[PDB]
Design a protein around this ligand. Structure first.
Ligand SMILES: Nc1ncnc2c1ncn2[C@@H]1O[C@H](COP(=O)(O)OP(=O)(O)O)[C@@H](O)[C@H]1O
Ligand SMILES: Nc1ncnc2c1ncn2[C@@H]1O[C@H](COP(=O)(O)OP(=O)(O)O)[C@@H](O)[C@H]1O
Ligand SMILES: Nc1ncnc2c1ncn2[C@@H]1O[C@H](COP(=O)(O)OP(=O)(O)O)[C@@H](O)[C@H]1O
Ligand SMILES: Nc1ncnc2c1ncn2[C@@H]1O[C@H](COP(=O)(O)OP(=O)(O)O)[C@@H](O)[C@H]1O
Ligand SMILES: [Mg+2]
Ligand SMILES: [Mg+2]
Ligand SMILES: [Mg+2]
Ligand SMILES: [Mg+2]
Lengths: 299, 299, 300, 296, 296, 299
């Protein structure tokens, strides 16, 4: 991404920069994608200078037309992260794709939290072996997150236990308003540092008891679009878990994966929906050290 | 169509042509269709020479009266793009007509994006099979375009895997203002070469996520009107996808096709609104290489 | 009455050509026009304008007319046939030749289908309700398809070739072009018999081009021109409207108004919202591939 | 009225009477009310002849003020025209009165055309039931006139349909000049046959498109001509309008408002003697009348 | 922390009393409460409620934190030993305080014995697996036998009078009484330090409820979760062999099987982090402990 | 215990008390332990009336928390019924605890009927020697009622045989509804007179139903038995054949005693379920005078 401090030019005061940052925008992409009406609504900003900064960002941030072959090259360039099972990578065609809010849904005790822990660890590892080189962002709504599993999985991957311990931002929410307030600080801290993943587990746990359906349904809509807005500005893959959101999950999520409890430690994962993948299923396994491919003993 | 650089006659200099270039009228047809008052509102153009260039444009572009024979022959000579499915081809009366807006709508995962991707390759094929011998353009709003689908489909008609990917302009919109802003750039770009298709997917996805209830319709009308002008200016097929506006989208779109999810790869299509087509219904199957007729194995 | 007929006791052809370029192509057009309009035209003197005015007035009756004579004259007016017996009975013969008829309602009500049906029928002989005159179609939304015309002609049995040969189309890209189309079309209404003008739609261009007052008197000018054409040539005029928006400018001009309501599938309800003569009522009609008609019992 | 034939006394030449008829003077009242200056303006009329005719006509009818004791009682026996509804008759205190000017203003679809049709059909019934015992004169300026209507209304009132249609004179104007010109033939018909009601519907419609000071002066000339015709021929005058000179010239003014269904609210606004009150009247296929109990 | 720190920024004592009437005994519940719940309280304005929430957030930590601090916080969490070191090793110190531990299995295996045993351990010092707090035992079948409590206290060396004078028994005859017992007990856990809640059982009353049972059970279970959150107290419940509805909120689940004589087998069936394994313990008159050579 | 008559305060009509008596609630303790619904379907009782009854019961009877010391001292003061044999009383901690569910299951013709008759006789002797000083109600279902044995045990303990016979109300059970009516009448005159022991021999004689419906109705019979025990603190003893019922009856049975037929008239009794008393065994004997300690001649 591009920092917002590289955007001010032609006698635009830093005070305007603070005013924009206090409103939630923290990068050039955020300003460029932001509608001009919202920028005008911010107090203490002239509309003429608002349009000046908007067109300066448009000159800086590229959003013009481009040939499809170039788009193919850029999409091949996109960072992709190994899940931890070669079968999963083959099914995903390389692994989890950033810039896309992937959803993993299914019945509980199928390894969703274990897979999320493995995802955080594989986002801690360097990009050379396919890692993300960035910090995760884990939002828990049930108290299930346990650092011991992270330590074990990191030791499987060989990373420093303390680096993995201190490079994950964990925050447990207690109500829907707490989640929404938490997202703002999440974005603010996202601004300064380099991250590579935002995992939420689970969105509906608090919403199930906080509610009155009409207020609940609209409250997710502004919540989820915040994750979508944050994903494109910073280019971080977004993973959402769920229990068995209706149409909101389907509309918001790009690639969906259903989970099923297989025999023993083996588990089934199915590509229910995808923009460029066929509906195919495969099998992985979960051990005390994380997530891997099923072994001959597991057969 | 009629290139703009051939209407210059009877004492109009290139300065007026450049002024029209900033005015947006990039074709003799465009200036002929534009109302006189808009020409008067253009700074630096006197009303006398405005009416002059208007009458040379009207001489060069026929605004007069045509019989049903002439317009019927022109209808016969209109270019239609093959849908890749004989059932769908017959449902559409032979393809997608020029200078008319098609609105595919329905619930998600019904294959609208697959239909758009399939159409994106039929334009470049030789016209004898039912193409248009041109180069496509893809304006996206949800980030679901995929060159890999074009790679897979180009082999159905034998097209080159890279000549298909270097002859498709691409761009993405992020906010409501950018969606309308892209159209002037599209018109400027398309004035140099024969485009044959435009895609907008989807229309109101940004408008729902953008008191505000009244203000969105007026913005929607301004954007949707611009597409209708674009089709008449250049004679190209524009395809807009919709999710489930109301009257604004119902009135503007020339043709409307509703999609429904069937069993497996089977999907149902119904002509919801057309001026000269019966309200029929057909079935089509999405395969690895695009949209096609259902197979006996899947039936 | 032909314009070339007005040549009496020394009408110079230069004055005739001046009238031609002034837009007046019918004897009624000069008979009804005020003298100030003639004086506003260059090359026209006041005394000669007055004498040509009286020469025009002595042909067409321009005085008191007893109500009985007006009633018998109006009862002889050719009523266009819409093919649907229900709607034809609703309006006492259908659309009348020489008055402004407006159709309005929500979307998906088949007004365009009715316009198409009237366009096809107005070419059939008088016995089957046609006007025996070529049709004119000013379109502002590109909703004309000359493929269905052949099918409708087959339903009405008249030959397809001459039925297609006997229509004129004009696409309208702007309100100024829409107004100029009437001036353009006046001469060919003065060249061969005409019985039907269709405009679709009225409000579409003014909705986008507009500022309220400017739109208001521009629409007033357009409606005045339409009424002038209807009076001069005696040709039926049908216009399409979508929903009212604009207030009363279209309500005062529109002699007849119909409102369309969605029914069940092919069923639609027509209600005479405004009419100086016929009482407010309602009726039902259906649309099929052959055109507008009365719904069948199976469709009920 | 008094025909101009008896005006000639002591060998007054018939040529002068013919010239007066060609000048719009068809009755002795017109000559009496005409000043000397317009008589001088007429070609072939001398000053001596002008003053002689003024003396002959003035000695027949007075012009100045009168004693109110006879004035109010003589105003009672004036011809009244019922509107077919008791609400309006009570509101007007006798209904429409001839020899005056009454305006009906309001929005469209308020029955103004319908009430004008009712007046035009009710002007022939005998005076015992609020009739007029005369023929109407309808001037139309929008094409709204639909004869058929009348037949049904006359059958409601029991008059013969053929007589109802044949005894109503109808004119249509295409321009303001044509509208003004029709008044010459109107005056000629007034001279030829007895009429007792005039309707204009609508007076202002053409002036919207035909035209500003020229428009105002033309309206003033039109209204003064109508007032004059009412003066000589004792014909009630009713005008229609859509929503200062017209109000000033008008004596009685009634505003119309749309009620519920067939019901509409009629209100008296300006009147020399009548108070300010409203009423409700219904309009049906048969015409204008009092609301039925079913609509209540 | 006590809600007494809330008396800042000019908010009156009356609001604190109203909150105490609604069970808002400690500041943790005030902070975790949603807006609507505190809005429902009578005599409370939303304007001051915004502040109330602000200082509630300031007093108790609510923002982001790195996982190192979370791990070191949960590592030093108080754990209550069961007297069976085999269990301790299996549970990594014993039962956690502030979470939900569920027991299921055959009644012949014996779980009420463990419920009795844990009652005294909450008072012994922390260095030997104690809690140093009060215990609140709720029974639904009247199995409370203080003689076993005296025996286990003598095994632990504590005074039986101290054991009987420190724990609080409560019995419920219905689901509503069970629900309101928690509300009543909130005052006692507010006024004094408690370190253990034992429920035996949770499905007994619900057996003698079908759809409304799930909502009632969810409310009761989330109330038990709230009590652990608002005071850091351990919560342990028993369940005879709910289902999935209990399973969602079940942080830890232990299944029991009957072995040879007094020997019993305990399996940690479900746990967020702990592996799936089994162990063996024994039951004697002194309580539940590690198996001895006599049972081997 | 608190009589139901004294419960009605503050406008509670006596007809409501009569309706409660007819329904089955004969004491204020029953209303105190009565739930919301059970009071709701009682005739003549409304929601406000039920709330008033519950409030009055809470005022009269302590409904809240009870400390361990108070519960222990109340249990200590509870009257225990002697068995007439030193060994059984020693194994039972002084005898049978009143107001508790005790099940005696064993082989037929092992003196279970004799033991029940002995307990019925000993529940009327003075408290100084472990008696009850109250009436007795013996419910027999197997036709084992023997007045001769009752007279013999009365002579053994010095009780007057006629005073022993008239102090015991004998009830024979034919059907499940019949025994429910019998226990309803039992509570009916318990509301007006004091008793000391309830004997049911045998429970499973009439149940052996429909297998599932047998459990809930038996549980309701167990539930009804517990209600009266808490209302009056009277010992209840039920005999079981050879245990039938399984989990439900095991949970209902607060204490269980298995019986075996030893040599001669001697019999063996062993505890099965006891939260406090450890499991052990004992031996007793049966003679014409009833059930007592074994003698040296049979030992
Ligand atoms: N320490 C561990 N070592 C190995 N496997 C474990 C461990 N803890 C849990 N599991 C496995 O993980 C599963 C729990 O899945 P989980 O990630 O909790 O799904 P959810 O979060 O949806 O409940 C259990 O079925 C169990 O078999
Ligand atoms: N390579 C493929 N082969 C066959 N079917 C596919 C392939 N890729 C996607 N599909 C199917 O086509 C559908 C595409 O739906 P889509 O056009 O994305 O709907 P929307 O545009 O409304 O989101 C998906 O449901 C998917 O199951
Ligand atoms: N050839 C045909 N056969 C049968 N039905 C048709 C045919 N053409 C159009 N229709 C149906 O009739 C309707 C016509 O409505 P339309 O004329 O578009 O109303 P409007 O012009 O007022 O928008 C359309 O909804 C269409 O589904
Ligand atoms: N044949 C008829 N039967 C019943 N009612 C009619 C008939 N003809 C006209 N009307 C009614 O008369 C009214 C005409 O109003 P109109 O007099 O034109 O008002 P305005 O003169 O103010 O425009 C219409 O509202 C209509 O309902
Ligand atoms: Mg989970
Ligand atoms: Mg799509
Ligand atoms: Mg249409
Ligand atoms: Mg009218």
């Amino acid at each position: 991404f591009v920092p917002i401090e590289k955007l001010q030019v032609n006698g635009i005061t830093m005070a305007d920069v603070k005013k924009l940052r206090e409103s939630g925008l923290h990068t050039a992409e955020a300003v460029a994608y932001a509608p001009r009406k919202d920028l005008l609504e911010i107090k203490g900003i002239s509309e003429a200078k608002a349009d000046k900064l908007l067109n300066e960002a448009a000159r800086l941030v590229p959003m013009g037309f481009v040939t499809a072959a170039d788009f193919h090259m850029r999409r091949s360039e996109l960072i992709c992260l190994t899940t931890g099972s070669k079968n999963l990578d083959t099914l995903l065609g390389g692994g989890v794709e950033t810039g896309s809010i992937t959803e993993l849904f299914g019945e509980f005790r199928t390894g969703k939290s274990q897979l999320c822990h493995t995802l955080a660890v594989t986002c801690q590892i360097p990009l050379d072996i396919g890692g993300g080189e960035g910090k995760c962002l884990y939002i828990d709504t049930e108290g299930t997150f346990r650092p011991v599993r992270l330590v074990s999985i990191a030791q499987r991957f060989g990373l420093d236990p303390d680096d993995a311990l201190n490079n994950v931002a964990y925050a447990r929410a207690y109500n829907a308003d707490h989640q929404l307030r938490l997202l703002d600080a999440a974005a603010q801290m996202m601004s300064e540092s380099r991250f590579s993943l935002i995992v939420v587990d689970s969105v509906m746990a608090l919403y199930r008891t906080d509610f009155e359906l009409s207020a609940r349904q609209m409250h997710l809509a502004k919540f989820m679009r915040a994750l979508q807005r944050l994903a494109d500005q910073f280019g971080v893959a977004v993973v959402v878990t769920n229990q068995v959101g209706g149409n909101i999950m389907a509309h918001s999520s790009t690639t969906r994966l259903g989970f099923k409890k297989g025999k023993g430690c083996q588990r089934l994962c199915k590509v229910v929906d995808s923009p460029c993948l066929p509906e195919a299923e495969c099998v992985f396994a979960i051990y005390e050290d994380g997530v891997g491919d099923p072994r001959e003993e597991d057969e």
